[PDB]
């Protein structure tokens, strides 16, 4: 339904887009023992097979299967940190704590982070001059459909207490058309979850206020209320000391 | 058709140490960490430790802290406990088994076939 | 420490009979519950974990149920090569520990 065009608004297929992903999945394999029955080059084919020779507004989840079944990683559901638009603490924050996962620290989510890639229909090609954004072009795109598909298995496996990272100096820190908001959150599974614990992330502001009472934060509590898990709020008024207290549990 | 193959049975003295092997053989073996439990001759089982396979880190029982080493060398397929300070009371059979890393820690799903450890002047 | 007590220490079947043992922990341990076998002069076998999610290959007649405190395994029709001792194992927190164990006997 999505009108044909060669041009988007959005950056190119990175370079060196297919190397990137076999290398970042050879690394991965010898980090973790527990992935080394993993081909690298079949994960790539299936990668490449998921958007290659598509209108890159015409992704489905369905696109991704073998992708995500070459990918299958059992990730200890009680070590998870979620973030919503505070990328650069939550890495941060499990560089330290190397026991805790983001999405980007399991297999899936470490090939892609940071790239950018997308095919063209009736033609083989990679293309590296643009692709679309999901506002500017379309929803459907490659990049989108990829982290929706593994967002949503990467919550569904979480359990106990999920902690969750939100950016408190955004105008809506909890914002529902986020993929944490429209997605993730969704996917948390009653009984398996027992909390969500959101951290409330400060700027540098001097009229420091409670932001866990802010109404997206009551927005958040609701939701997770109605699934019948547990909600709490922290204020993190110094998250550089919080990355320095954190290295001690 | 993955298997937990350990060391042969062992005879020590009091105050010695025994070194026990753990290697898998004949499947992908995905286990997030290698756990140790032991069974003195006809009573229950009891955990010693774990070590979590891509960190090296280890969590051991209280009455084993000091005396238990966990091994699970990255650039090699074994795994080792190492018991030091040996008691008759240390006679049992050792056992390592397979976590699948559901949970962080989870149950066994895979068990060594175990390694007699006779502690005795 | 967690404290496992099993019930009843023995347990004497028929093949045929349903069979029901129970595990309770000392505190709350959510689902994080495991069932173990073990036959004379051989290492466990995996059966349940979570409380009542089955190891790959085990037969559909094992089952268990439980949340917090109080754990089931069912046999629900006890075959020969089920007479073994049945182990409760609770992996919420540190020590990880053990029930007593439940041994199931042939009744005659």
């Known amino acids: 339904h999505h009108r044909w065009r060669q041009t988007w608004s959005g950056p190119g297929t990175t370079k060196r887009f297919p190397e990137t992903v076999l290398a970042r999945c050879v690394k991965y394999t010898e980090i973790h023992p527990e992935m080394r029955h993993v081909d690298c080059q079949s994960v790539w084919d299936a990668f490449k097979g998921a958007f290659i020779s598509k209108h890159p507004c015409d992704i489905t989840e369905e696109d991704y299967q073998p992708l995500m079944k070459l990918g299958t990683q059992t990730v200890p559901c009680n070590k998870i940190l979620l973030w919503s638009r505070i990328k650069d603490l939550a890495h941060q924050f499990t560089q330290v704590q190397r026991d805790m996962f983001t999405l980007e620290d399991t297999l899936l989510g470490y090939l892609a982070d940071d790239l950018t890639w997308c095919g063209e229909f009736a033609t083989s090609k990679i293309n590296y001059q643009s692709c679309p954004d999901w506002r500017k072009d379309c929803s459907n795109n490659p990049v989108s459909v990829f982290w929706k598909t593994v967002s949503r298995r990467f919550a569904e496996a979480a359990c106990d207490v999920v902690h969750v990272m939100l950016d408190g100096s955004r105008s809506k820190i909890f914002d529902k058309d986020s993929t944490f908001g429209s997605v993730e959150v969704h996917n948390l599974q009653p009984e398996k979850v027992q909390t969500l614990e959101a951290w409330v992330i400060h700027g540098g502001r001097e009229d420091s206020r409670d932001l866990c009472q802010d109404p997206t934060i009551k927005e958040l509590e609701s939701i997770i209320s109605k699934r019948n898990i547990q909600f709490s709020c922290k204020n993190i008024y110094r998250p550089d000391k919080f990355l320095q207290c954190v290295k001690n549990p | 058709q993955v298997q937990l193959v350990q060391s042969g049975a062992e005879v020590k003295k009091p105050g010695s140490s025994v070194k026990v092997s753990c290697k898998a053989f004949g499947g992908t073996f995905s286990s997030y960490a290698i756990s140790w439990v032991r069974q003195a001759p006809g009573q229950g089982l009891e955990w010693m430790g774990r070590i979590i396979r891509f960190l090296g880190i280890a969590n051991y029982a209280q009455k084993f802290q000091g005396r238990v080493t966990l091994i699970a060398d990255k650039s090699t397929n074994t795994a080792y406990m190492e018991l030091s300070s040996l008691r008759s009371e240390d006679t049992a059979v050792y056992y390592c088994?397979?976590?699948?890393?559901?949970?962080?820690?989870?149950?066994?799903?895979?068990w060594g076939q175990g390694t007699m450890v006779t502690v005795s002047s | 420490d967690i404290q496992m007590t099993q019930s009843p220490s023995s347990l004497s079947a028929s093949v045929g009979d349903r069979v029901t043992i129970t595990c309770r922990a000392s505190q709350g341990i959510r689902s994080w519950l495991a069932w173990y076998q073990q036959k004379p002069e051989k290492a466990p076998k995996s059966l349940i974990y979570?409380?009542?999610s089955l190891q790959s290959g085990v037969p559909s007649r094992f089952s268990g149920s439980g949340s917090g405190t109080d754990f089931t395994l069912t046999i629900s029709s006890l075959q020969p090569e089920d007479f073994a001792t049945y182990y409760c194992?609770?992996?919420?927190?540190?020590?990880?520990?053990f029930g007593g164990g439940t041994k199931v006997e042939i009744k005659r």
């Open positions: 088994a397979g976590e699948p890393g559901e949970r962080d820690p989870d149950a066994v799903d895979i």
């Open positions: 194992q609770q992996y919420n927190s540190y020590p990880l520990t």
């Open positions: 979570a409380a009542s």
